[PDB]
């Protein structure tokens, strides 16, 4: 169910991060794990490059702090022409907020539009009020 948000960006869940067979058929070379507790599945195989963003899906969690780290990673994955998977435990809130924000800054889109695109491919996404609110400040601060 890994949703191709882009040619070079896929958004999925925990079971998605485990399907190695699938992942190298899609050409994934990069993984962002947006959890605090889950393994970097397949790390020992030496296949992928990984970045953990140890966030929880709380109304108290700050993702804006990770926005930059995730973009630099995603853009390198573009510059090198291989796929990137971004996952949480379910692809609904944490990992989607980060996708929405990249689609904002490194594609030409407002939040409404970036959110609309992603929900159109992956309609289970439901970022919580806290994440929404952090997406709004990000819009202001870009279009400052």
From Swiss-Prot:
Superkingdom field: Eukaryota
Active site: 88
Tissue/organ expression: Expressed in keratinocytes (at protein level). Detected in brain.
Domain Tyrosine-protein phosphatase: 1-144
Compartments where located: Cytoplasm; Nucleus
Role: Protein phosphatase involved in the inactivation of MAP kinases. Has a specificity for the MAPK11/MAPK12/MAPK13/MAPK14 subfamily. It preferably dephosphorylates p38.
The protein's assembly and partners: Monomer. Interacts with MAPK14.
Family: Belongs to the protein-tyrosine phosphatase family. Non-receptor class dual specificity subfamily.
Protein name in UniProt: Dual specificity protein phosphatase 10
The species this protein was found in: Homo sapiens (Human)
Parent sequence residues shown: 321 to 464 of 482
């Amino acid at each position: 169910e890994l949703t191709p948000i882009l040619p070079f960006l896929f958004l999925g869940n925990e079971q998605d991060a485990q399907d190695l067979d699938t992942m190298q058929r899609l050409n994934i070379g990069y993984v962002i794990n947006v959890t605090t507790h889950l393994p970097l599945y397949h790390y020992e195989k030496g296949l992928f490059n990984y970045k953990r963003l140890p966030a929880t899906d709380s109304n108290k969690q700050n993702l804006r702090q990770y926005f930059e780290e995730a973009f630099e990673f995603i853009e390198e994955a573009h510059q090198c022409g291989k796929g990137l998977l971004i996952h949480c435990q379910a692809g609904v809130s944490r990992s989607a907020t980060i996708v929405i924000a990249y689609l904002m800054k490194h594609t030409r889109m407002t939040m409404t539009d970036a959110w609309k695109f992603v929900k159109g491919k992956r309609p289970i996404i439901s970022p919580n009020l806290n994440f929404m609110g952090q997406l709004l400040e990000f819009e202001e601060d870009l279009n400052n």
